[PDB]
Amino acid sequence: FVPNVHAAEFVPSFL
Amino acid sequence: PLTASMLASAPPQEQKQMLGERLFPLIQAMHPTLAGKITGMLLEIDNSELLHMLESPESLRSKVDEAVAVLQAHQAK
């Protein structure tokens, strides 16, 4: 696994 | 618990979100501010491995530690 610093942030929005 | 069967039967466009919802609180426990970014980075891993990470705390921590080491180095430079 090579981490991708460009990855989209996971926004918590589950309710 | 989220199972492989549940994931495989979900529309592909919901699969990452389903995994993310279960991984996020665990990653947030480890890293309360970087959690969103680290979760996003981990979600690029394939779904089989993500499900394994959900079931194996040592596996999740190893991936989180690698993402954090890389992210923090990136932030610093």
Residue numbers in the entry:
A (entry chain B): 76 to 90
B (entry chain A): 544 to 620
Paper text:
Cytoplasmic poly(A)-binding protein (PABP), also termed PABPC or PABPC1, is an essential protein that binds to and mediates the stimulatory effect of the poly(A) tail on translation initiation. Previous studies showed that MLLE is a peptide-binding domain that specifically recognizes a conserved PAM2 (for PABP-interacting motif 2) sequence. Unlike other PAM2-containing proteins, eRF3 possesses two overlapping PAM2 sequences (PAM2-N and PAM2-C), which each independently bind to the MLLE domain of PABPC1 with low micromolar affinity. Here, we determined two crystal structures of the MLLE domain of human PABPC1 in complex with the PAM2-N and PAM2-C peptides from human eRF3.
We obtained well-diffracting co-crystals with eRF3 residues 67–81 (PAM2-N) and 76–90 (PAM2-C). The C-terminal site (PAM2-C), in particular, lacks a leucine recognition element that is found in essentially all other PAM2 peptides. Overlay of the MLLE/PAM2-N and MLLE/PAM2-C structures reveals striking similarity of the bound conformations despite the highly divergent peptide sequences. The peptides adopt an extended conformation interrupted by a β-turn at residues Asn70-Val71-Asn72 in PAM2-N and at residues Asn79-Val80-His81 in PAM2-C. The most significant differences between the two peptide complexes occur at the N-terminus where PAM2-C lacks a highly conserved leucine residue. In its place, Phe76 bends back to partly occupy the space vacated by the missing leucine side chain. Thus eRF3 Phe76 plays two distinct roles in the complexes, alternately occupying the hydrophobic pocket between MLLE helices α2 and α3 in the PAM2-N complex and between helices α3 and α5 in the PAM2-C complex. Positions 1 and 2 are normally occupied by polar or charged residues, which do not participate in MLLE binding except in the MLLE/PAM2-C structure where phenylalanine in position 1 binds in combination with proline at position 3. Glutamic acid is preferred at position 9 and makes hydrogen bonds with amides of Gly579 and Lys580 in the PAM2-C structure via ordered water molecules. The simultaneous requirement for Phe76 for MLLE binding by both PAM2-N and PAM2-C explains the previous observations of a one-to-one stoichiometry of eRF3 binding to PABPC1 despite the existence of two PAM2 motifs.
